[PDB]
Amino acid sequence: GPGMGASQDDYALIHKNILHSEDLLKYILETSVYPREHEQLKGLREVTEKHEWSTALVAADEGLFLSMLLKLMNAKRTIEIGVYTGYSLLTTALALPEDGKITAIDVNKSYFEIGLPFIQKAGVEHKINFIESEALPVLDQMLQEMKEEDLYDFAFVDADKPNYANYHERLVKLVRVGGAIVYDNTLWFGTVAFPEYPGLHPEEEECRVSFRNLNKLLAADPRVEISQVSIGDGLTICRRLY
Amino acid sequence: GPGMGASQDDYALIHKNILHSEDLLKYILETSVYPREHEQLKGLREVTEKHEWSTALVAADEGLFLSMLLKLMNAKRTIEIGVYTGYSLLTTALALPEDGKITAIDVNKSYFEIGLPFIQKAGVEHKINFIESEALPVLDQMLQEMKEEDLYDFAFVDADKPNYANYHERLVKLVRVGGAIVYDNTLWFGTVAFPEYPGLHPEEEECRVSFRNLNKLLAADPRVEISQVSIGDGLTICRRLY
Ligand SMILES: Nc1ncnc2c1ncn2[C@@H]1O[C@H](CSCC[C@H](N)C(=O)O)[C@@H](O)[C@H]1O
Ligand SMILES: Nc1ncnc2c1ncn2[C@@H]1O[C@H](CSCC[C@H](N)C(=O)O)[C@@H](O)[C@H]1O
Numbered sequence: 001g002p003g004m005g006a007s008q009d010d011y012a013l014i015h016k017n018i019l020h021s022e023d024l025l026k027y028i029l030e031t032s033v034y035p036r037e038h039e040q041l042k043g044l045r046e047v048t049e050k051h052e053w054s055t056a057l058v059a060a061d062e063g064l065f066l067s068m069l070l071k072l073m074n075a076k077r078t079i080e081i082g083v084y085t086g087y088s089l090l091t092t093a094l095a096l097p098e099d100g101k102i103t104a105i106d107v108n109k110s111y112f113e114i115g116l117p118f119i120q121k122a123g124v125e126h127k128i129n130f131i132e133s134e135a136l137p138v139l140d141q142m143l144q145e146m147k148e149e150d151l152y153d154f155a156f157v158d159a160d161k162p163n164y165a166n167y168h169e170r171l172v173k174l175v176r177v178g179g180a181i182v183y184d185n186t187l188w189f190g191t192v193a194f195p196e197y198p199g200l201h202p203e204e205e206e207c208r209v210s211f212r213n214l215n216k217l218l219a220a221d222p223r224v225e226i227s228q229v230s231i232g233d234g235l236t237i238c239r240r241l242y
Numbered sequence: 243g244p245g246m247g248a249s250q251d252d253y254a255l256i257h258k259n260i261l262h263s264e265d266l267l268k269y270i271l272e273t274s275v276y277p278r279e280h281e282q283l284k285g286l287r288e289v290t291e292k293h294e295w296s297t298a299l300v301a302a303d304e305g306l307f308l309s310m311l312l313k314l315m316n317a318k319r320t321i322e323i324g325v326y327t328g329y330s331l332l333t334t335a336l337a338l339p340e341d342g343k344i345t346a347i348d349v350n351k352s353y354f355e356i357g358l359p360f361i362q363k364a365g366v367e368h369k370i371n372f373i374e375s376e377a378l379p380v381l382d383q384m385l386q387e388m389k390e391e392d393l394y395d396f397a398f399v400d401a402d403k404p405n406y407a408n409y410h411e412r413l414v415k416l417v418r419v420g421g422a423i424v425y426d427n428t429l430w431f432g433t434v435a436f437p438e439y440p441g442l443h444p445e446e447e448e449c450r451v452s453f454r455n456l457n458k459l460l461a462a463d464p465r466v467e468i469s470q471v472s473i474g475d476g477l478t479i480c481r482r483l484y
């Protein structure tokens with residue numbers, strides 16, 4: 001719609017971190033991440049770093065953390081909401097077993113085609129089923145067709161941030177009991193810690209208010225036990241109880 | 243020498259944080275941690291905050307993360323090194339199923355007796371086998387007694403930091419293949435990002451060097467996959483590959 005420019009350069013929080021020191025984040029990346037990063041994940045990240053929406057790319061240290069979660073819970077069927085160029089999608093496909101399956105949903109396949117060559121040369125494209133659509137209509141039709149023995153083990157939510165609460169009401173019925181739902185950016189550059197934060201782009205302000213509402217909602221939801229982790233831009237792990 | 247003894251006020255780092263703000267950290271605790279904290283964990287934490295070594299108490303948001311890791315990986319048998327007043331121990335005991343068993347090792351049981359009444363009221367003391375000893379002799383004795391059916395699914399290391407690398411050589415044999423080892427304080431108040439740090443206590447400088455060596459070691463160890471997480475004072479998750 002008509003209005004103000006909503007490009008990445010129009011944003012205010014691009015360079016703000018939740019860690020105190022930029023040295024500390026670089027230490028973690030140089031010491032414990034880059035020596036453990038797949039060669040194709042490195043290539044996908046370096047291309048994405050130059051993209052016009054580079055701020056949406058998931059942090060590399062967080063990627064190695066999501067891979068650890070998938071392996072420890074022995075996930076085999078997962079769903080990803082928000083693919084972009086596919087860093088977390090490639091991370092997920094590399095962690096799953098050979099017969100693992102992923103449902104990847106994004107409104108823009110042009111983003112996904114940027115990282116598709118890296119995914120292919122990693123040899124894990126066969127696990128991925130890409131759905132070019134809005135995520136909410138896909139999840140609602142899944143509610144129509146999913147049987148209990150088809151429920152997902154793991155779900156990464158990283159698409160349109162104000163819609164997390166809407167995705168939640170579907171994913172607690174699409175993920176198995178004891179499965180995991182992870183919401184990304186739940187600390188939003190640290191702006192959620194304050195009732196008001198001046199000088200944000202209108203869309204950044206919408207995310208701050210929506211994340212402050214989601215965090216209260218997740219902490220009070222009896223269907224789930226939560227864990228908010230201050231890695232990357234912050235994430236909340238959600239385990240379905242019933 | 244003789245006098246008043248070791249204080250946590252002799253240390254230079256106890257007031258430091260890795261997050262950008264104390265408001266952000268207190269937001270995480272007030273929003274997502276305290277409403278989910280067990281009543282006995284709250285009582286244990288509040289008494290421990292007045293102890294003379296309250297700096298070593300595991301952060302409450304990290305406790306929920308460890309509880310989440312135990313359930314997602316379906317842990318049943320764990321080992322804890324460094325108990326103190328038992329916050330992480332009580333966190334672990336509440337997370338495990340009713341038939342879970344924990345081997346808790348600490349050189350000082352007087353610390354543990356501070357938290358024992360809270361563990362009893364929670365009704366989980368039957369899962370805990372406390373051993374008052376130095377950790378290394380106990381771990382070595384386990385290696386000659388351990389059968390494959392007795393391997394641990396999970397190990398939390400949070401004792402004397404300079405001994406982590408020595409604990410690592412034992413724990414990759416005591417933890418089952420696919421099991422997890424978590425090393426606490428691997429970021430050490432952010433000092434690991436600096437080759438030199440001024441004004442540190444001799445024991446504080448010793449662990450900054452130790453953790454700079456351990457983080458390089460763990461990132462190069464081909465026996466495990468790793469994931470360093472910037473929660474609390476930073477931790478490193480290790481998953482055994484063979
Ligand atoms: N309504 C919607 N439904 C599905 N996807 C959407 C959406 N709105 C935005 N998106 C997509 O969600 C993505 C978020 S960027 C996600 C980053 C990626 N997961 C990573 O690991 O780096 C964008 O590519 C955007 O195209
Ligand atoms: N060599 C050693 N072997 C076993 N325990 C040790 C040790 N050196 C120190 N410790 C113990 O390890 C503890 C570290 S503080 C640990 C904090 C605790 N895990 C928590 O949840 O808060 C101290 O209580 C100390 O008594």
Ligand SMILES: [Mg+2]
Nearest residue numbers: 058158184185
């Ligand atoms: Mg993100």
Ligand SMILES: [Mg+2]
Nearest residue numbers: 298400426427
């Ligand atoms: Mg600690």
